[PDB]
Short mmCIF file of C-alpha atoms and ligand atoms in Angstrom, two decimals:
data_model
loop_
_atom_site.label_atom_id
_atom_site.label_comp_id
_atom_site.label_asym_id
_atom_site.label_seq_id
_atom_site.Cartn_x
_atom_site.Cartn_y
_atom_site.Cartn_z
CA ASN A 1 -24.83 -298.12 -21.59
CA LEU A 2 -24.78 -296.57 -18.13
CA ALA A 3 -23.99 -298.11 -14.69
CA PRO A 4 -26.70 -297.78 -11.99
CA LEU A 5 -26.33 -295.01 -9.47
CA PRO A 6 -24.80 -295.93 -6.07
CA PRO A 7 -26.73 -295.11 -2.90
CA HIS A 8 -24.31 -292.49 -1.58
CA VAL A 9 -24.19 -290.39 -4.82
CA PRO A 10 -26.73 -287.51 -4.86
CA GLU A 11 -28.70 -286.96 -7.97
CA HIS A 12 -27.71 -283.35 -8.64
CA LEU A 13 -24.02 -284.29 -9.08
CA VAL A 14 -24.55 -286.71 -12.01
CA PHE A 15 -23.02 -285.60 -15.35
CA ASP A 16 -22.52 -288.53 -17.76
CA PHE A 17 -19.12 -287.94 -19.31
CA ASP A 18 -17.35 -290.68 -21.35
CA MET A 19 -13.58 -290.29 -21.34
CA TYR A 20 -13.14 -292.69 -24.25
CA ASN A 21 -15.79 -291.08 -26.46
CA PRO A 22 -16.80 -287.53 -25.45
CA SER A 23 -19.84 -286.13 -27.21
CA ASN A 24 -18.10 -282.90 -28.41
CA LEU A 25 -15.15 -284.72 -29.91
CA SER A 26 -15.34 -283.10 -33.35
CA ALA A 27 -14.51 -279.64 -32.00
CA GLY A 28 -11.14 -280.94 -30.67
CA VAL A 29 -10.39 -283.21 -27.73
CA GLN A 30 -9.34 -280.44 -25.32
CA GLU A 31 -12.59 -278.63 -26.20
CA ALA A 32 -14.56 -281.82 -25.72
CA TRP A 33 -13.07 -282.22 -22.22
CA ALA A 34 -13.60 -278.53 -21.44
CA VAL A 35 -17.29 -278.95 -21.38
CA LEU A 36 -16.84 -280.10 -17.72
CA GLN A 37 -15.78 -276.55 -16.85
CA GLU A 38 -18.86 -274.64 -17.87
CA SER A 39 -21.23 -272.62 -15.60
CA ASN A 40 -23.73 -275.40 -14.91
CA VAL A 41 -21.22 -278.07 -13.79
CA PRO A 42 -19.87 -278.46 -10.15
CA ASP A 43 -16.23 -278.87 -9.13
CA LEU A 44 -16.75 -282.61 -8.60
CA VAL A 45 -19.10 -284.80 -10.59
CA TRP A 46 -20.21 -288.47 -10.93
CA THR A 47 -20.46 -290.10 -14.37
CA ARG A 48 -22.33 -293.36 -14.89
CA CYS A 49 -20.18 -294.15 -17.94
CA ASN A 50 -17.35 -296.79 -17.88
CA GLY A 51 -18.51 -298.58 -14.74
CA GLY A 52 -19.08 -295.39 -12.76
CA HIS A 53 -16.56 -292.89 -11.27
CA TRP A 54 -15.90 -289.36 -9.98
CA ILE A 55 -14.22 -286.60 -11.96
CA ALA A 56 -12.60 -283.58 -10.45
CA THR A 57 -12.92 -280.77 -12.99
CA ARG A 58 -10.88 -277.90 -11.46
CA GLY A 59 -7.15 -277.32 -11.07
CA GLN A 60 -7.41 -276.70 -7.27
CA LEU A 61 -9.01 -280.10 -6.56
CA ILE A 62 -6.74 -281.97 -8.97
CA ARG A 63 -3.59 -280.65 -7.30
CA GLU A 64 -4.98 -281.27 -3.85
CA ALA A 65 -5.83 -284.89 -4.66
CA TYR A 66 -2.38 -285.60 -6.19
CA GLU A 67 -0.65 -284.32 -3.03
CA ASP A 68 -2.74 -286.51 -0.69
CA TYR A 69 -1.54 -290.09 -1.33
CA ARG A 70 -3.00 -291.25 2.00
CA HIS A 71 -6.65 -290.91 0.83
CA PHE A 72 -6.00 -291.08 -2.95
CA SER A 73 -4.00 -294.14 -3.88
CA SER A 74 -2.01 -295.05 -7.05
CA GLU A 75 -2.77 -298.77 -6.63
CA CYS A 76 -5.64 -298.60 -9.17
CA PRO A 77 -4.87 -295.68 -11.50
CA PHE A 78 -6.73 -296.50 -14.70
CA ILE A 79 -10.44 -296.36 -15.62
CA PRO A 80 -12.32 -298.77 -16.10
CA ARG A 81 -11.84 -300.58 -12.82
CA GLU A 82 -10.52 -303.86 -14.37
CA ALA A 83 -7.82 -301.96 -16.31
CA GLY A 84 -6.83 -300.30 -13.03
CA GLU A 85 -6.68 -303.57 -11.16
CA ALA A 86 -4.49 -305.28 -13.82
CA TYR A 87 -2.15 -302.20 -13.78
CA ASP A 88 1.07 -303.03 -11.95
CA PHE A 89 3.77 -300.88 -13.55
CA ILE A 90 6.66 -299.45 -11.47
CA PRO A 91 6.76 -296.85 -9.97
CA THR A 92 3.36 -295.65 -11.05
CA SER A 93 1.29 -298.36 -9.27
CA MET A 94 2.82 -297.70 -5.81
CA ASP A 95 2.34 -294.97 -3.22
CA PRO A 96 5.10 -293.49 -1.05
CA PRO A 97 7.08 -294.57 0.85
CA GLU A 98 7.94 -297.63 -1.17
CA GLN A 99 7.72 -296.10 -4.71
CA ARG A 100 10.48 -293.53 -3.94
CA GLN A 101 13.37 -296.02 -4.22
CA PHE A 102 12.46 -297.07 -7.80
CA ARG A 103 12.50 -293.43 -8.97
CA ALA A 104 16.30 -292.95 -8.65
CA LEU A 105 16.95 -296.02 -10.82
CA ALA A 106 14.51 -294.97 -13.59
CA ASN A 107 16.24 -291.61 -13.47
CA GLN A 108 19.55 -293.25 -14.43
CA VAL A 109 18.15 -294.22 -17.88
CA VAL A 110 15.80 -291.30 -18.75
CA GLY A 111 17.05 -288.43 -16.62
CA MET A 112 18.97 -285.23 -17.38
CA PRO A 113 22.53 -286.64 -17.85
CA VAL A 114 21.32 -289.26 -20.34
CA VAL A 115 19.59 -286.48 -22.25
CA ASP A 116 22.90 -284.57 -22.49
CA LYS A 117 24.44 -287.88 -23.62
CA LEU A 118 21.79 -288.38 -26.40
CA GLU A 119 21.62 -284.68 -27.47
CA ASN A 120 23.88 -285.21 -30.46
CA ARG A 121 21.82 -288.12 -31.86
CA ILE A 122 18.55 -286.29 -31.19
CA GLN A 123 19.91 -283.41 -33.26
CA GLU A 124 21.21 -285.74 -36.06
CA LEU A 125 17.92 -287.61 -36.43
CA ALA A 126 15.58 -284.52 -36.64
CA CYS A 127 17.62 -282.89 -39.40
CA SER A 128 17.87 -286.12 -41.36
CA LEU A 129 14.15 -286.83 -41.25
CA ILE A 130 13.09 -283.30 -42.16
CA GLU A 131 15.65 -282.89 -44.96
CA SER A 132 14.23 -286.09 -46.41
CA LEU A 133 10.66 -284.80 -46.41
CA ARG A 134 11.60 -281.33 -47.57
CA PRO A 135 11.72 -281.70 -51.36
CA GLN A 136 8.51 -283.72 -51.29
CA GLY A 137 6.08 -280.88 -50.62
CA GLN A 138 3.87 -283.07 -48.45
CA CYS A 139 3.67 -285.66 -45.59
CA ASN A 140 1.37 -287.43 -43.25
CA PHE A 141 3.07 -285.90 -40.22
CA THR A 142 2.02 -288.59 -37.71
CA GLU A 143 3.46 -291.42 -39.82
CA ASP A 144 6.37 -289.52 -41.27
CA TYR A 145 7.84 -287.62 -38.36
CA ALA A 146 5.86 -287.80 -35.07
CA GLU A 147 6.21 -291.57 -34.73
CA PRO A 148 9.66 -292.35 -36.10
CA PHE A 149 11.47 -289.49 -34.31
CA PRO A 150 10.67 -290.21 -30.66
CA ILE A 151 10.39 -294.04 -31.09
CA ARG A 152 13.73 -294.51 -32.91
CA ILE A 153 15.47 -292.53 -30.13
CA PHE A 154 13.94 -294.81 -27.49
CA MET A 155 14.85 -298.03 -29.30
CA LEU A 156 18.43 -296.72 -29.50
CA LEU A 157 18.32 -295.87 -25.79
CA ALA A 158 16.92 -299.28 -24.84
CA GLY A 159 18.89 -301.34 -27.39
CA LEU A 160 15.93 -302.99 -29.12
CA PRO A 161 15.66 -303.63 -32.95
CA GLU A 162 13.78 -301.14 -35.13
CA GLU A 163 11.80 -303.91 -36.89
CA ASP A 164 9.94 -304.55 -33.63
CA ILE A 165 8.24 -301.10 -33.62
CA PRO A 166 4.93 -302.03 -35.21
CA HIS A 167 4.21 -304.84 -32.79
CA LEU A 168 5.22 -302.77 -29.71
CA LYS A 169 3.35 -299.58 -30.82
CA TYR A 170 0.08 -301.55 -31.34
CA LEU A 171 0.19 -303.12 -27.84
CA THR A 172 0.96 -299.76 -26.20
CA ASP A 173 -1.99 -298.11 -27.91
CA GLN A 174 -4.45 -300.79 -26.64
CA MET A 175 -3.60 -299.74 -23.09
CA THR A 176 -4.16 -296.05 -23.71
CA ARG A 177 -6.91 -295.96 -26.47
CA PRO A 178 -8.52 -299.42 -26.71
CA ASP A 179 -10.42 -300.53 -29.81
CA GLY A 180 -11.93 -303.54 -28.06
CA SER A 181 -9.79 -306.34 -29.56
CA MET A 182 -7.65 -306.71 -26.43
CA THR A 183 -8.37 -306.13 -22.79
CA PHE A 184 -5.83 -304.03 -20.86
CA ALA A 185 -4.74 -307.28 -19.06
CA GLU A 186 -4.15 -309.03 -22.40
CA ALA A 187 -2.10 -306.13 -23.83
CA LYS A 188 0.02 -305.92 -20.69
CA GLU A 189 0.71 -309.64 -20.54
CA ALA A 190 1.82 -309.64 -24.16
CA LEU A 191 4.21 -306.77 -23.54
CA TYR A 192 5.68 -308.87 -20.66
CA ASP A 193 5.99 -311.89 -22.87
CA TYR A 194 8.23 -309.77 -25.12
CA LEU A 195 10.37 -308.37 -22.28
CA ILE A 196 11.10 -311.43 -20.02
CA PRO A 197 13.52 -313.21 -22.47
CA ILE A 198 15.33 -309.93 -23.04
CA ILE A 199 15.66 -309.08 -19.42
CA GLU A 200 16.99 -312.57 -18.65
CA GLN A 201 19.41 -312.21 -21.59
CA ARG A 202 20.92 -308.88 -20.42
CA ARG A 203 21.21 -310.15 -16.85
CA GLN A 204 23.62 -312.92 -18.04
CA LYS A 205 25.30 -310.56 -20.57
CA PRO A 206 25.08 -306.85 -19.51
CA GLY A 207 25.40 -304.00 -22.03
CA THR A 208 25.24 -300.21 -21.57
CA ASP A 209 21.62 -299.78 -22.87
CA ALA A 210 18.66 -298.82 -20.75
CA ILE A 211 17.23 -302.29 -20.20
CA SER A 212 20.65 -303.63 -19.03
CA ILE A 213 20.94 -300.80 -16.42
CA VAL A 214 17.48 -301.37 -14.96
CA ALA A 215 17.86 -305.13 -14.88
CA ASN A 216 21.19 -305.03 -13.19
CA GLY A 217 20.32 -302.12 -10.93
CA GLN A 218 19.86 -301.62 -7.20
CA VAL A 219 17.06 -300.06 -5.18
CA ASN A 220 18.14 -298.59 -1.91
CA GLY A 221 20.97 -301.14 -1.68
CA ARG A 222 19.27 -304.35 -2.57
CA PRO A 223 19.43 -306.02 -6.06
CA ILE A 224 16.37 -305.54 -8.15
CA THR A 225 14.32 -308.71 -8.89
CA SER A 226 13.58 -309.87 -12.49
CA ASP A 227 9.87 -309.20 -11.81
CA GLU A 228 10.36 -305.62 -10.71
CA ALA A 229 12.69 -304.92 -13.66
CA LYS A 230 9.96 -306.28 -15.96
CA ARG A 231 7.41 -303.91 -14.51
CA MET A 232 9.68 -300.86 -14.62
CA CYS A 233 10.73 -301.68 -18.21
CA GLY A 234 7.05 -302.03 -19.19
CA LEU A 235 6.32 -298.43 -18.09
CA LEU A 236 9.38 -296.99 -19.92
CA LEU A 237 8.24 -298.69 -23.14
CA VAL A 238 4.71 -297.25 -22.88
CA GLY A 239 6.07 -293.82 -21.95
CA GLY A 240 8.62 -293.79 -24.82
CA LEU A 241 6.12 -294.97 -27.44
CA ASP A 242 2.89 -293.03 -26.73
CA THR A 243 3.51 -289.60 -25.17
CA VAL A 244 5.76 -287.19 -27.20
CA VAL A 245 4.54 -288.99 -30.38
CA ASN A 246 1.00 -287.71 -29.73
CA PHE A 247 1.84 -284.28 -28.49
CA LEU A 248 4.06 -283.37 -31.47
CA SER A 249 1.02 -283.81 -33.67
CA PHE A 250 -1.25 -281.52 -31.61
CA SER A 251 1.55 -278.87 -31.65
CA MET A 252 2.00 -279.09 -35.41
CA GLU A 253 -1.67 -279.11 -36.21
CA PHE A 254 -1.97 -275.76 -34.29
CA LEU A 255 1.12 -274.33 -36.03
CA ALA A 256 -0.24 -275.18 -39.47
CA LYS A 257 -3.53 -273.40 -38.53
CA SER A 258 -1.98 -270.26 -37.17
CA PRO A 259 0.62 -268.56 -39.45
CA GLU A 260 1.01 -265.71 -36.90
CA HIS A 261 2.34 -268.05 -34.11
CA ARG A 262 4.54 -269.64 -36.79
CA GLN A 263 5.90 -266.26 -37.70
CA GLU A 264 6.66 -265.17 -34.12
CA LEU A 265 8.97 -268.16 -33.62
CA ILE A 266 10.68 -267.72 -37.02
CA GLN A 267 11.42 -264.02 -36.25
CA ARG A 268 12.54 -264.94 -32.68
CA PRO A 269 13.82 -268.53 -32.32
CA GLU A 270 14.85 -267.62 -28.72
CA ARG A 271 11.13 -267.68 -27.70
CA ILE A 272 10.95 -271.36 -28.65
CA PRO A 273 11.66 -272.69 -25.06
CA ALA A 274 8.83 -270.45 -23.74
CA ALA A 275 6.52 -271.47 -26.62
CA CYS A 276 7.08 -275.15 -25.73
CA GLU A 277 5.65 -274.58 -22.24
CA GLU A 278 2.50 -272.76 -23.43
CA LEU A 279 1.85 -275.55 -25.99
CA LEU A 280 2.30 -278.10 -23.27
CA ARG A 281 -0.37 -276.22 -21.28
CA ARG A 282 -2.81 -275.78 -24.08
CA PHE A 283 -2.42 -279.18 -25.74
CA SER A 284 -2.13 -281.25 -22.54
CA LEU A 285 -3.10 -284.89 -23.23
CA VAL A 286 -2.96 -287.19 -20.17
CA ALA A 287 -5.81 -288.19 -17.88
CA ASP A 288 -5.60 -290.88 -15.18
CA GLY A 289 -6.60 -290.97 -11.52
CA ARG A 290 -6.68 -292.63 -8.07
CA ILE A 291 -8.67 -294.89 -5.81
CA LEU A 292 -10.18 -293.99 -2.37
CA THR A 293 -8.56 -295.91 0.50
CA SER A 294 -11.21 -294.79 3.04
CA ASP A 295 -14.41 -292.82 3.29
CA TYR A 296 -13.59 -289.19 2.99
CA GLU A 297 -15.43 -285.87 2.84
CA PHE A 298 -13.65 -283.96 0.06
CA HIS A 299 -14.97 -280.38 -0.41
CA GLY A 300 -18.39 -281.23 1.02
CA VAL A 301 -18.91 -284.39 -1.02
CA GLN A 302 -19.03 -287.94 0.43
CA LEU A 303 -16.52 -290.23 -1.20
CA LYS A 304 -16.72 -293.87 -0.27
CA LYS A 305 -13.91 -296.42 0.19
CA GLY A 306 -13.29 -298.12 -3.17
CA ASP A 307 -14.50 -295.23 -5.41
CA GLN A 308 -12.32 -294.33 -8.39
CA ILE A 309 -11.75 -290.62 -9.19
CA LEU A 310 -10.41 -289.32 -12.49
CA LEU A 311 -8.08 -286.39 -11.94
CA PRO A 312 -7.34 -285.12 -15.45
CA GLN A 313 -3.85 -283.59 -15.69
CA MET A 314 -5.24 -282.09 -18.92
CA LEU A 315 -7.89 -279.89 -17.21
CA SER A 316 -5.67 -278.02 -14.71
CA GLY A 317 -4.13 -275.73 -17.31
CA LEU A 318 -7.36 -275.21 -19.27
CA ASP A 319 -9.12 -274.00 -16.05
CA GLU A 320 -9.83 -270.27 -16.29
CA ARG A 321 -9.38 -269.96 -12.51
CA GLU A 322 -5.60 -270.75 -13.15
CA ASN A 323 -5.04 -269.11 -16.56
CA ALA A 324 -7.08 -266.21 -18.00
CA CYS A 325 -8.56 -266.83 -21.49
CA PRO A 326 -7.37 -270.46 -21.34
CA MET A 327 -8.15 -271.62 -24.86
CA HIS A 328 -6.08 -268.77 -26.33
CA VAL A 329 -2.40 -269.61 -27.03
CA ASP A 330 -0.08 -266.83 -25.89
CA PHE A 331 3.73 -267.23 -26.01
CA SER A 332 4.29 -264.14 -23.76
CA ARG A 333 2.05 -265.33 -20.92
CA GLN A 334 3.47 -264.18 -17.55
CA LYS A 335 2.84 -267.37 -15.56
CA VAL A 336 2.09 -270.57 -17.52
CA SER A 337 0.34 -272.89 -15.11
CA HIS A 338 -0.23 -276.57 -15.84
CA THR A 339 0.09 -280.14 -14.49
CA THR A 340 0.85 -281.64 -17.87
CA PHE A 341 3.66 -283.76 -16.49
CA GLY A 342 1.78 -284.61 -13.33
CA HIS A 343 1.70 -283.30 -9.72
CA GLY A 344 2.95 -284.68 -6.41
CA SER A 345 5.22 -287.67 -5.90
CA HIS A 346 4.68 -289.07 -9.39
CA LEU A 347 6.10 -286.12 -11.37
CA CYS A 348 7.18 -287.28 -14.80
CA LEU A 349 10.86 -288.45 -14.87
CA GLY A 350 11.05 -288.23 -18.73
CA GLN A 351 10.07 -284.56 -18.85
CA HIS A 352 13.54 -283.35 -19.74
CA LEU A 353 13.78 -285.81 -22.64
CA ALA A 354 10.33 -284.79 -23.74
CA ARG A 355 11.03 -281.04 -23.84
CA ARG A 356 14.34 -281.60 -25.73
CA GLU A 357 12.64 -283.61 -28.46
CA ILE A 358 9.88 -280.94 -28.66
CA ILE A 359 12.24 -277.94 -28.82
CA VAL A 360 14.64 -279.64 -31.29
CA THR A 361 11.60 -280.44 -33.53
CA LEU A 362 10.29 -276.85 -33.49
CA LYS A 363 13.69 -275.23 -34.17
CA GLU A 364 14.87 -277.61 -36.92
CA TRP A 365 11.46 -277.82 -38.72
CA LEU A 366 10.79 -274.01 -38.85
CA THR A 367 14.42 -273.55 -39.96
CA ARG A 368 13.82 -275.69 -43.03
CA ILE A 369 10.07 -275.41 -43.73
CA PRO A 370 8.80 -272.10 -42.39
CA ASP A 371 5.57 -272.05 -44.38
CA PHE A 372 3.16 -274.97 -44.35
CA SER A 373 -0.56 -275.71 -44.13
CA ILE A 374 -3.12 -278.39 -43.54
CA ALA A 375 -4.04 -280.19 -46.82
CA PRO A 376 -7.12 -278.36 -48.08
CA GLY A 377 -10.54 -279.83 -47.27
CA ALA A 378 -9.05 -282.48 -44.94
CA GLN A 379 -10.89 -282.76 -41.60
CA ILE A 380 -8.57 -283.44 -38.68
CA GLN A 381 -9.93 -285.93 -36.16
CA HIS A 382 -8.85 -286.60 -32.57
CA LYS A 383 -9.16 -289.64 -30.33
CA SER A 384 -9.67 -289.61 -26.52
CA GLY A 385 -8.36 -292.00 -23.86
CA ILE A 386 -5.81 -292.19 -21.04
CA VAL A 387 -3.48 -290.44 -23.49
CA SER A 388 -5.34 -288.46 -26.24
CA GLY A 389 -4.07 -288.29 -29.82
CA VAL A 390 -4.44 -287.35 -33.51
CA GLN A 391 -5.44 -289.91 -36.14
CA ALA A 392 -3.75 -288.36 -39.16
CA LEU A 393 -2.15 -284.96 -40.14
CA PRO A 394 -1.70 -284.31 -43.89
CA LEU A 395 0.50 -281.26 -44.33
CA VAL A 396 1.32 -279.34 -47.60
CA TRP A 397 4.00 -276.82 -48.41
CA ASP A 398 5.60 -275.58 -51.57
CA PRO A 399 9.27 -276.73 -51.86
CA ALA A 400 10.40 -273.35 -53.28
CA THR A 401 9.80 -271.67 -49.92
CA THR A 402 12.06 -274.19 -48.16
CA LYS A 403 15.79 -273.96 -47.07
CA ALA A 404 18.40 -276.68 -47.16
CA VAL A 405 20.69 -276.14 -44.21
C1 LIG B 501 4.49 -285.10 -23.73
C2 LIG B 501 5.20 -286.01 -22.86
C3 LIG B 501 4.85 -286.59 -21.65
C4 LIG B 501 3.77 -286.35 -20.84
C5 LIG B 501 2.58 -285.33 -21.00
C6 LIG B 501 3.92 -287.21 -19.62
C7 LIG B 501 3.06 -287.25 -18.53
C8 LIG B 501 3.23 -287.95 -17.35
C9 LIG B 501 2.34 -287.92 -16.21
C10 LIG B 501 1.01 -287.23 -16.06
C11 LIG B 501 2.88 -288.77 -15.21
C12 LIG B 501 2.22 -289.06 -13.85
C13 LIG B 501 1.31 -290.28 -13.83
C14 LIG B 501 0.47 -290.43 -12.56
O1 LIG B 501 0.52 -289.56 -11.70
O2 LIG B 501 -0.23 -291.45 -12.46
C15 LIG B 501 4.06 -289.33 -15.76
C16 LIG B 501 4.89 -290.22 -15.14
C17 LIG B 501 5.98 -290.96 -15.72
N1 LIG B 501 6.49 -290.66 -16.99
FE1 LIG B 501 5.82 -289.24 -18.32
N2 LIG B 501 5.08 -287.91 -19.69
C18 LIG B 501 5.68 -287.57 -20.94
C19 LIG B 501 6.76 -288.12 -21.41
C20 LIG B 501 7.47 -289.18 -20.84
C21 LIG B 501 8.57 -289.94 -21.59
C22 LIG B 501 9.11 -289.67 -22.88
C23 LIG B 501 8.99 -291.00 -20.70
C24 LIG B 501 10.16 -291.65 -20.80
C25 LIG B 501 10.29 -293.01 -21.22
C26 LIG B 501 8.08 -290.86 -19.55
C27 LIG B 501 8.24 -291.65 -18.32
C28 LIG B 501 7.54 -291.51 -17.12
C29 LIG B 501 7.83 -292.28 -15.91
C30 LIG B 501 8.94 -293.24 -15.68
C31 LIG B 501 6.83 -291.92 -15.00
C32 LIG B 501 6.62 -292.56 -13.64
C33 LIG B 501 7.13 -291.77 -12.50
C34 LIG B 501 6.58 -292.20 -11.17
O3 LIG B 501 5.55 -292.83 -11.12
O4 LIG B 501 7.22 -291.88 -10.17
N3 LIG B 501 7.14 -289.75 -19.62
N4 LIG B 501 4.31 -288.80 -17.05
C1 LIG B 502 1.88 -291.02 -19.72
C2 LIG B 502 2.09 -292.28 -18.84
C3 LIG B 502 3.56 -292.81 -19.08
C4 LIG B 502 1.91 -292.04 -17.40
C5 LIG B 502 0.37 -291.71 -17.37
C6 LIG B 502 -0.24 -292.61 -18.50
C7 LIG B 502 1.05 -293.38 -18.93
C8 LIG B 502 0.81 -293.90 -20.31
C9 LIG B 502 1.39 -294.42 -17.91
O1 LIG B 502 0.97 -295.55 -17.77
C10 LIG B 502 1.99 -293.50 -16.85
K1 LIG B 503 -3.05 -302.43 -9.66
#
């Protein structure tokens, strides 16, 4: 149920939003979150759900809060409170100045030059998976492409066996969209139980994979400890297994429902980079936040030391103060404004690898299967959380319209 109102929270600012189960969920998850941006609702509200916390609802306030690490700390970034307390991943659980040194090391394994290195295998794998599904006339897109494609690339990058994917994917999902069988703390500890033996193994026998580079790496001179390497590798696992996976499915659900947008990109495959950005704005999917270090008056509201505030990256680009007609997808938008990959000092390091997996998917899929639909009568359901997603996505096409390349 609800959590009792704190003394400092005025009554006219209460709007009971549940981020794990929004009441408008059937209309789509972005639409369900967009109810916070209607005429009746203020820029900053308090919900009594999930222990009780603030939510900033506007792009202006979300950008402002992510720039100010002094008042708004990363130490406790997840809601509910006990998930945020247990959270100790690197570099996401630290503020500047100390987080900055770990960023350069993580950038060695997921940054731009490693993307260039992988580009040939990313190409190879997409074409292979799509050419396999092509004669079939149908697929559950989430199972058949959206999961195997990003995840297999990450397991290659990190040098882990493919047979381990089911176990790891399950644990990751409990951290982002819990079903109640595991607490955040139990999920995290089980991921660490997996990593520790492997990090010890590649510290005595180094390879060229991602885990070997992190474990044998250096932060601003000094050798990195086994503990820090475990906490950095934990984040990379979560990021590689539950981000692009979920976004690909939102993008393809839209494309199956809009043959005009599908056609524009077939006619002009050079607009596909630009299309990628608009889809990232419209189908943004991440929402975490920050904790108040002191009492602070933020835009005429009293925040108290210890309060959690959810600062949904998702909402910035759906805000009509930033983009006009925000629920409409337009590939020739003049300025595409979002904070899909974050804002401030914690800007997503894997964003280059993300965009390449997205752009290669669009180009290579439309090139082979230009005409497809949602399976008729099937109702598409979303799920909300720290990272939102899609439960299933049955597609159908007719194999005579396809092209073997
Ligand atoms: C659709 C794809 C993706 C989205 C929307 C996304 C979103 C984000 C967001 C919002 C943050 C900031 C978190 C915060 O401020 O608390 C972030 C950080 C981060 N992401 Fe991503 N991400 C994506 C893909 C990836 C991938 C594929 C990886 C690579 C394994 C990854 C690795 C990281 C890392 C290492 C950080 C931590 C950076 C730091 O704290 O300094 N992300 N991402
Ligand atoms: C997307 C992410 C990698 C980023 C925000 C949520 C996430 C799952 C993390 O724990 C950090
Ligand atoms: K913490």
